[PDB]
């Protein structure tokens, strides 16, 4: 019940851009606020403490400001090594509290998703369950939107997707939605398709298969 | 005995992170450096003057 | 000590100052409080930890008892001569390196205090007099906002200068 | 005047009785300190990398390797973290004579 | 300067207990307080606990309190987090961080550990099921491998043992309500060299010592 | 540092002061200029060179690789024990002697500055006020001859005292 | 006042990026320094007093 | 030196001050005299003796000439290598430990003086002006009892404050 | 090679006046003292503060 809120949840930016994130605290915390940087799968780094004191290792690109209730971190000229998630943290009182994180992402040209479809392998049918996999490959920005249509019937609460990170070579995303049915509910239908809308595409795109 | 240590001397095992020990010059394992002192304490704080 | 502040012109410490090594005691209309100088305490902490690490980070690697027969008395005495020779060097080094740095650390802290007191005197100039024991009596009215302005070093001097001029002339 | 508010500058004090030596002075009580010197042991010989030492007991390297009949507790020895000779380690060569370069052998064995 | 080497992560069952370690490589650590912070998979950072340089005190989150005990062994230059009434919502990677000020607590975390993963679940260790994802058409086709129903911690995949990392995509694991973990890895391969060239994915499941080999080919 | 002048009460250095390590910036009617304190810079230079020479002049003379056969393993280990033993001592000495003297030198320079600033304050007394950052605002008119008199330490105090009295009373 | 001429006291600064270590602090940039440590060689065996070594 | 008092702002020593290392010269109606500050001289003496004892108390125990035959040239060179190795260490230690502590002692004394001068300035406040060379000219009448009160640090400030106010205003 | 030096080590000749080298412990001629350091630089000047 201190509550730290971070705004926005994402920003995409070109290297060289001035990015500015905000963090708001539900009650006055004087100027006792710190900012951390975390790249995925590594530990956080400290950047700023006491609202605006720069920590010794840190490039002076970084700059905090604010007092009482509203705080901002500013990166003056985003470098390649600055794409990561940024968390603020109140150091006024215990328990200590982290804002929820602001991801800052690279901004490349728009790239449309190369989309593929994948039937459940006949080995998998023997186990009892059937998994259909839809692949959206190398697209920018994070966008779609897949719809599993099975004989033109739409699905809900029976597919789950997961996304990769911005690819380190070319800044793209990939995505895969998997449809988990039972072997019997897989039998009841013959035409299986996923439909993608993404901004790199004017008309929605479909890949489909026929079971047999 | 059936104990474990990362540093052993003929008098007994040492289970410690300090840079120096005055237990024995002979050690097996990862041990602090042996010196002849009875006291090596480094000030970090200030002179402690709790009142008039 | 060397800078005559600790156990010097400031006669004693504050058991009531939990938050740091150096700081401020204030008295105004609103009340009394303590506050640590977070920045200088921090500089000190970093300084001291670095000192400690250097003394230790240095020291490294070496004893593997040997035997000699009744006709090897010369190499045996040399081996002992070697073992004792290094042991005394390393003992002397250690003991004296500690005596030296202890002396220097207590002087460091002393300096930090003197320097903190001087940073204030510097800001306040003739808007307050020195009344000894590291205390500053204000010629003007200093509320909680004005005290904070001293501690973060951003005190507005001319703001209260005119009110303070007229107080030195009379009472 | 008129109120005459006061600010003062000061330093930490606490209930520490830790004392250090400086060159100019001895037994100076300080607020915080670090001990650099270990002086405690557990009075036992223990495992290293979880392997027990070899306790030669009444035997010595010589009686051990030669197979002095008082050393039968040692016949099945194969691994260890280090070798212990006690100050009762008397059983070595039982039939009398010189063990040539014995001290060199001890050295070889200590690795 | 200070490296904090973390220790004691592992798979555990709700109710049963676990102890974490944070050992500092440098003597001066014993002059600083230590934080524990954790991060639920895909989620935000959450403060857990602090202990001062002596162990004098000693602070906890509300998320956890009366279930976790923080302790400290300054002679061994290490810090401990004992976790008893474990619950599936305590699953996370756990980080210890040194405090910026201690001797004087400042509540900011300046040196971090690598982090240690703890998984609270009532689920037996299980070796992954693997399936082919068969390619057929498109532009310049793509193929992959479905690695379903595994437990627990992580798996690793590589293509032709590592004789191709050109355009490989391994998606994060997903925890379905069975309590098992599913994921898949895919690759777009230049040309219609599918009815000729061999491709093999190798899944290595450590927390079970399973190595699986999947040759994949079309219809 | 220890004497709170460098990176202290005098916040920064002068890239415009080519002629020395310590000195003076003046502003009068005739213009603006820099001038080194030749004497204290000189004292410093001599001090520092002497320090450097002592650390080095000390160090002197000694390695001549040896061989041993398969039955000489004990004297071989002793030889290595000796070689490594001295090498660590000499390494520690050197590294730490440098860490120590670096610390002391930066404090020396700091002291020199503080001491220079105090030498002036001392001369000028109440004929000029301290306006911070090591600056002295004159209550009187100080031409090029008067500035030179400060820098060579032969400033005539009473000469301008009467003109300065009447300026503190009013403006 | 009236003119209020000023004299100030200061120290040298330059465009040196030489850094030293002190006990309290690391990588301190200083105006001047001396290197005490040689770390360069010419990777060859050479003459001494103008006499070539014996290469066995 | 470091604290700019000895051979600094106090230009020279007093061959007329037999009783101590630091002290006071007074001039009143009754006459002229010297007096040592017994307490600070004492603190110094104890400090310095302790320093001297530490450097020496450290050093302890060890040479016993050996012979070798024509086929023992390697152990002979090692023995010499050992003997020379320790002799240079112990020589360096000693010479440099003395150079270091000499530097520090002269600074200690310097500090003691500055600190003594500051202890007085502190007491007298604006009841006397600083006239340079470590001298205090009294705005009031200071007899032998009043001088003693300065030296034992128990000077009654307000006692003479009113007499001193009216003397700064006019002459 | 046909070069000249006043100090030689198995890695190469040293042509220098410094008191220390970290090249190799074995030297022939007049050489700087070998130490294990990677840095021995002595301040002579002051802390360099080129502006605010
Ligand atoms: C093992 O060691 C013991 C102790 O030295 C030997 O027993 C001793 O032998 C001497 C000489 O014969 C006797 O005078 C003593 O009575 C014995 N002392 C003790 C304490 O028992 C024994 O000879 C050794 N055994 C072998 C096989 O070498
Ligand atoms: C001593 O160290 C070993 C591991 O090196 C450990 O098993 C033992 O419990 C340690 N002692 C204490 C008091 O924890
Ligand atoms: C310092 O304390 C120890 C405590 O054992 C005592 O032996 C010694 O007398 C003390 N030294 C001095 C100079 O008071
Ligand atoms: C000092 O600089 C070196 C340059 O290689 C770097 O490795 C190190 O991180 C720096 N140390 C600190 C404490 O900033
Ligand atoms: C190196 O030293 C020798 C003489 O000792 C000389 O002939 C050679 O030219 C020197 N190197 C340089 C760069 O001058």
DSSP states of chain F as a string? Answer: -TTSTBTTTB---BTT-TT-SEEEEEESSS-EEEEE-HHHHHHHHHHHHHHHHHHHHH-----------TT-HHHHHHHHHHHHHHHHHHHHHHHHHHHHHHHHHHHHHHHHHHHHHHHHHHHHGGGEEE-STTEEEESS---HHHHHHHHTT---TGGGHHHHHHHHH--
**Residue nearest (by alpha carbon) to ligand 3 atom 7:** D27
| Token digits of residue E177 | 């309500």
Please report residues of G whose CB lies closer than 8 A to that of C102: none
- As beta bridge partners, residue B28 has B8
CB-CB contact of F100 with F117 (8 Å)? no
Longest dimension (CA), chain D: 105
How far, in Å, CA of H68 to CA of H74, rounded? Answer: 9
How far, in Å, CA of C122 to CA of C136, rounded? Answer: 12
E1-122: which CATH topology? Immunoglobulin-like (2.60.40)
How far, in Å, CA of A205 to CA of A144, rounded? Answer: 11
CB-CB contact of A106 with A12 (8 Å)? yes
How far, in Å, CA of A178 to CA of E171, rounded? Answer: 12
Task: Reply yes or no: is the peptide bond before residue H16 cis, omega within 30 of 0.
Answer: no
- As beta bridge partners, residue A163 has A175
**F and E interact (at least 3 Cβ pairs within 8 A):** no
End-to-end CA distance of chain F: 36
Size of chain G in residues? 56
Chain-centroid distance of CA E153 in Å reads 6
| Token digits of residue A11 | 């920003």
CB-CB contact of H124 with H155 (8 Å)? yes
Residue of B nearest to E23 (CA): B17
Same domain (yes/no): A171, A99 = no
- As beta bridge partners, residue G30 has I47
Query: Which residue among A53, A72, A107 closes a domain?
Result: A107
How far, in Å, CA of F153 to CA of C31, rounded? Answer: 49
- As beta bridge partners, residue E111 has E98
CB-CB contact of I13 with I7 (8 Å)? yes
Q: Tell if the CB–CB gap between I48 and G29 is shorter than 8 Å.
A: yes
Quick one: which atom of ligand 4 is closest to the CA of G26?
Answer: 13
Nearest to E182 by CA among E139, E149, E156: E149
Chain breaks in chain A following residues, C–N > 2.5 Å: none
Query: Helix %, strand %, coil % for chain C, to 5?
Result: 55, 10, 30
D69 CB less than 6 Å from ligand 1? yes
Same domain (yes/no): A24, A60 = yes
Residue with tokens 């039968």: D72
* Smallest Cα distance from C94 to chain H, Å: 11
If contacts are CB pairs under 8 Å, which of residues 39-78 in chain E contact chain D? 75
User: CA geometry: angle at E10 spanning E5 and E16, to 5°?
Assistant: 125
Residue to mutate (ligand 1; options D56, D91, D92, D93; most atoms within 8 A of CB): D91
How far, in Å, CA of H118 to CA of H128, rounded? Answer: 13
How far, in Å, CA of C59 to CA of D9, rounded? Answer: 39
**Helix (DSSP H) and strand (DSSP E) numbers for chain C:** 4, 4
**G and C interact (at least 3 Cβ pairs within 8 A):** yes
Task: Reply yes or no: is the peptide bond before residue H152 cis, omega within 30 of 0.
Answer: no
Q: Tell if the CB–CB gap between H82 and C84 is shorter than 8 Å.
A: no
Decide: helix, strand or coil at residue H50: helix
Same domain (yes/no): A56, A139 = no
Q: Which of B4, B16, B50 sits opposite D47 (nearest CB)?
A: B4
* Smallest Cα distance from C163 to chain G, Å: 21
CB-CB contact of A192 with A119 (8 Å)? yes
**Residue nearest (by alpha carbon) to ligand 4 atom 9:** A57
How far, in Å, CA of A64 to CA of A73, rounded? Answer: 4
Q: Which residues of F79-102 are buried (b: 16+ CB within 10 A; e: fewer)?
A: bebbbebbbbbbbbbbbbbbbbbb
Sequence-distant (≥ 6) Cβ neighbours of residue E39 within 8 angstroms: E45, E46, E92, E93, E95, E115
Residue H113: enclosing H or E segment and its boundaries? helix H73-124
| Token digits of residue C163 | 């009110």
Question: Does A94 touch chain E if contact means CB atoms closer than 8 Å?
Answer: yes
**Residue nearest (by alpha carbon) to ligand 3 atom 6:** D27
| Token digits of residue D40 | 């405690």
Same domain (yes/no): A65, A158 = no
* Smallest Cα distance from D108 to chain E, Å: 34
How buried is I52 (Cβ within 10 angstroms: 0-12 exposed, 13-18 middle, 19+ buried)? exposed
How far, in Å, CA of H83 to CA of F51, rounded? Answer: 29
How far, in Å, CA of C151 to CA of C140, rounded? Answer: 17
CB-CB contact of A118 with A86 (8 Å)? no
How buried is D79 (Cβ within 10 angstroms: 0-12 exposed, 13-18 middle, 19+ buried)? exposed
How far, in Å, CA of H111 to CA of H40, rounded? Answer: 11
Residue with tokens 């009160």: H149
Subunits with 3+ Cβ pairs within 8 Å of D are B, C, E, F, H
Same domain (yes/no): A141, A56 = no
Q: Rounded to the nearest whole angstrom, what is the distance from the C-alpha of residue I14 to the centroid of ligand 5?
A: 9
- As beta bridge partners, residue E51 has E34, E58
Print the SS3 string covering chain B.
CCCECCEEECCEECCCCCCEECCCCCCEECCCEECCCCCCEEECCCECCCCC
Please report residues of E whose CB lies closer than 8 A to that of A123: 131-132
D60 CB less than 6 Å from ligand 1? no
How far, in Å, CA of E16 to CA of E85, rounded? Answer: 6
Q: Which residues of A107-136 are buried (b: 16+ CB within 10 A; e: fewer)?
A: beeebbbbbbbbbbbeebbeeebbbbbbbb
Residue H76: enclosing H or E segment and its boundaries? helix H73-124
CB-CB contact of D10 with C136 (8 Å)? no
Question: Does E166 touch chain D if contact means CB atoms closer than 8 Å?
Answer: no
- As beta bridge partners, residue E22 has E6, E79
Nearest to D5 by CA among E120, C141, F122: C141
Beta strands in C10-165 (DSSP E): 22-27, 32-36, 128-130, 135-138
Residue with tokens 């502590």: H101
* Smallest Cα distance from F93 to chain I, Å: 10
How far, in Å, CA of E218 to CA of E196, rounded? Answer: 11
| Token digits of residue C18 | 């939990």
Q: Rounded to the nearest whole angstrom, what is the distance from the C-alpha of residue I3 to the centroid of ligand 5?
A: 8
Same domain (yes/no): A122, A197 = yes
- Could you say which ligand is closest to the alpha carbon of residue G19? 4
- Residue A112 phi, psi dihedral angles, 5° rounding: -75, 150
- As beta bridge partners, residue E120 has E12
| Token digits of residue A194 | 């996923």
Quick one: which atom of ligand 3 is closest to the CA of D26?
Answer: 13
B5 CB less than 6 Å from ligand 2? yes
Q: Tell if the CB–CB gap between D107 and F71 is shorter than 8 Å.
A: no
- Residue E75 phi, psi dihedral angles, 5° rounding: -70, -40
Query: Which residue among A107, A133, A156 closes a domain?
Result: A107
Residue with tokens 């260490």: H89
Nearest to B40 by CA among F117, H112, C100: C100
**Residue nearest (by alpha carbon) to ligand 5 atom 13:** I15
Q: C104: how many CB neighbours lie within 10 A of its CB?
A: 22
How far, in Å, CA of H17 to CA of D49, rounded? Answer: 71
Residue with tokens 């898949």: E184
Question: Does F75 touch chain G if contact means CB atoms closer than 8 Å?
Answer: no
**Residue nearest (by alpha carbon) to ligand 3 atom 10:** D27
- As beta bridge partners, residue A130 has A181
Q: Rounded to the nearest 10 degrees, what angle do helices H73-124 and H144-151 cross at?
A: 140
Quick one: which atom of ligand 2 is closest to the CA of B3?
Answer: 7
Quick one: which atom of ligand 5 is closest to the CA of I6?
Answer: 5
CB-CB contact of F28 with F45 (8 Å)? no
How far, in Å, CA of F39 to CA of G19, rounded? Answer: 27
Q: Rounded to the nearest 10 degrees, what angle do helices F73-124 and C73-124 cross at?
A: 20
Subunits with 3+ Cβ pairs within 8 Å of A are E
Longest dimension (CA), chain I: 54
Q: Tell if the CB–CB gap between H59 and C92 is shorter than 8 Å.
A: yes
How far, in Å, CA of I42 to CA of G21, rounded? Answer: 9
Q: Rounded to the nearest whole angstrom, what is the distance from the C-alpha of residue E115 to the centroid of ligand 2?
A: 23
In CATH terms, are E1-122 and E123-219 the same topology?
Answer: yes
E123-219: which CATH topology? Immunoglobulin-like (2.60.40)
Q: Which of F4, F9, F85 sits opposite C86 (nearest CB)?
A: F85
User: CA geometry: angle at B50 spanning B47 and C2, to 5°?
Assistant: 30
CB-CB contact of E76 with B16 (8 Å)? yes
Please report residues of D whose CB lies closer than 8 A to that of E103: 32
How far, in Å, CA of F76 to CA of H75, rounded? Answer: 10
Residue with tokens 């930016």: A13
State how far the alpha carbon of C134 is from the alpha carbons of C5, C21, C114, E48, F85, in Å: 8, 15, 9, 41, 51
| Token digits of residue F31 | 């213009």
Size of chain D in residues? 111
- As beta bridge partners, residue C35 has C24
Nearest to B48 by CA among C13, C101, C10, C40: C13
User: CA geometry: angle at H160 spanning H157 and H165, to 5°?
Assistant: 105
Residue with tokens 């921090």: C42
How far, in Å, CA of H26 to CA of D42, rounded? Answer: 67
Sequence-distant (≥ 6) Cβ neighbours of residue E114 within 8 angstroms: A43, E4, E5, E6
State how far the alpha carbon of C111 is from the alpha carbons of C117, F8, G10, in Å: 10, 12, 21
| Token digits of residue E79 | 């810090």
| Token digits of residue F24 | 């003076």
Size of interface B-C (CB pairs under 8 A): 71
Q: What is the CATH number of domain C1-171?
A: 3.90.20.10
| Token digits of residue E93 | 């990677």
Question: Does I13 touch chain G if contact means CB atoms closer than 8 Å?
Answer: yes
Which structural domain range is residue A12 located in? 1-107
Experiment type = X-ray
Q: H29: how many CB neighbours lie within 10 A of its CB?
A: 8
How far, in Å, CA of A102 to CA of A9, rounded? Answer: 5
Decide: helix, strand or coil at residue H167: helix
Residue with tokens 């290598």: H81
How far, in Å, CA of B35 to CA of A158, rounded? Answer: 70
CB-CB contact of G25 with G13 (8 Å)? no
* Smallest Cα distance from C157 to chain B, Å: 32
Residue H89: enclosing H or E segment and its boundaries? helix H73-124
């Amino acid at each position: 019940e201190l509550q730290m809120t971070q705004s926005p949840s994402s920003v995409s930016a070109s290297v060289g851009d001035r990015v500015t994130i905000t963090c708001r605290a539900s009650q006055g915390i004087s100027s006792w606020l710190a900012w951390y940087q975390q790249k995925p799968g590594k530990a956080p780094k400290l950047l700023i403490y006491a609202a605006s004191s720069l920590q010794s290792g840190v490039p002076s690109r970084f700059s905090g400001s604010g007092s009482g209730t509203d705080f901002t971190l500013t990166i003056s000229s985003l470098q390649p090594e600055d794409f990561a998630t940024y968390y603020c943290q109140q150091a006024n009182s215990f328990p200590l509290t982290f804002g929820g994180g602001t991801k800052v992402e690279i901004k490349r040209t728009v790239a449309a998703p190369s989309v593929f479809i994948f039937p459940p392998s006949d080995e998998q049918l023997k186990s009892g369950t059937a998994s259909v996999v839809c692949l959206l490959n190398n697209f920018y920005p994070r966008e779609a939107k897949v719809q599993w249509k099975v004989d033109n019937a739409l699905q809900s609460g029976n597919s789950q997707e997961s996304v990769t990170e911005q690819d380190s070579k070319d800044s793209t995303y990939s995505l895969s939605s998997t449809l988990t049915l039972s072997k019997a509910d897989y039998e009841k239908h013959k035409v299986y398709a996923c439909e993608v809308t993404h901004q790199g595409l004017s008309s929605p795109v479909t890949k489909s298969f026929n079971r047999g | 005995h059936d104990c474990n240590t990362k540093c052993q001397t003929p008098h007994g095992a040492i289970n410690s992170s300090l840079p120096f020990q005055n237990i024995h010059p002979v050690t097996i394992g990862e041990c602090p450096k042996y010196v002849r002192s009875t006291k090596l304490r480094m000030a970090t704080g200030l002179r402690n003057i709790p009142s008039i | 000590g060397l800078f005559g502040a600790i156990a010097g012109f400031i006669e004693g410490g504050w058991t009531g100052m939990i938050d740091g090594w150096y700081g401020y005691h204030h008295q105004n209309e609103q009340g009394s409080g303590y506050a640590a100088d977070q920045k200088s305490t921090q500089n000190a902490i970093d300084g001291i930890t670095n000192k400690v690490n250097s003394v230790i980070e240095k020291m490294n690697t070496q004893a593997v008892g040997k035997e000699f027969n009744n006709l090897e008395r010369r190499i045996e005495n040399l081996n002992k001569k070697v073992d004792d020779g290094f042991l005394d060097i390393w003992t002397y080094n250690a003991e004296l390196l500690v005596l030296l740095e202890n002396e220097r650390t207590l002087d460091f802290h002393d300096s930090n205090v003197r320097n903190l007191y001087e940073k204030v005197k510097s800001q306040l100039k003739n808007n307050a007099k020195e009344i000894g024991n590291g205390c500053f009596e204000f010629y003007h009215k200093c509320d909680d906002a004005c005290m904070e302005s001293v501690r973060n070093g951003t005190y507005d001097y001319p703001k209260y200068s005119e009110e303070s001029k007229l107080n030195r002339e009379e009472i | 005047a008129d109120p005459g508010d006061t600010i003062c500058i000061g330093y930490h004090a606490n209930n520490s009785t830790d004392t250090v030596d400086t060159v100019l002075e001895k037994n100076v009580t300080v607020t915080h300190s670090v001990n650099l010197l270990e002086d405690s042991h557990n009075g036992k010989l223990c495992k290293l990398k979880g392997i027990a030492p070899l306790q030669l007991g009444k035997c010595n390297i010589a009686g051990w390797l030669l197979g002095n009949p008082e050393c039968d507790l040692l016949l099945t020895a194969s691994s260890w973290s280090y070798i212990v000779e006690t100050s009762n380690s008397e059983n070595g060569t039982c039939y009398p004579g010189d063990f040539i370069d014995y001290e060199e052998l001890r050295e070889q064995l200590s690795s | 300067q200070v490296q904090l080497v973390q220790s004691g992560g592992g798979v555990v069952q709700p109710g049963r207990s676990l102890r974490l370690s944070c050992a500092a490589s440098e003597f001066t650590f014993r002059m600083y307080a230590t934080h524990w912070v954790r991060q639920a998979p895909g989620k935000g950072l959450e403060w857990v606990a602090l202990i001062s340089y002596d162990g004098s005190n000693k602070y906890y989150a509300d998320s956890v309190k009366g279930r976790f005990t923080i302790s400290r062994d300054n002679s061994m230059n290490t810090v401990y987090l004992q976790m008893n009434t474990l619950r599936p919502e305590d699953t996370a990677v756990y980080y210890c961080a040194r405090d910026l000020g201690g001797y004087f607590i400042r509540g900011i975390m300046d040196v971090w550990g690598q982090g240690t993963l703890v998984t609270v679940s009532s689920a037996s260790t299980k070796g992954p099921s693997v399936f082919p994802l068969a390619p057929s058409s498109g532009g310049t086709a793509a193929l992959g491998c479905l690695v379903k129903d595994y437990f627990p911690e992580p798996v690793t995949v590589s293509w032709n043992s590592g004789a191709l990392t050109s355009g490989v995509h391994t998606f994060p694991a997903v925890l379905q309500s069975s309590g098992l973990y599913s994921l898949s890895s895919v690759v777009t391969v230049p040309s219609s060299s599918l009815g000729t060239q061999t491709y093999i994915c190798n899944v290595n499941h450590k927390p079970s010592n399973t190595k699986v080999d999947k040759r994949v080919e079309p219809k």
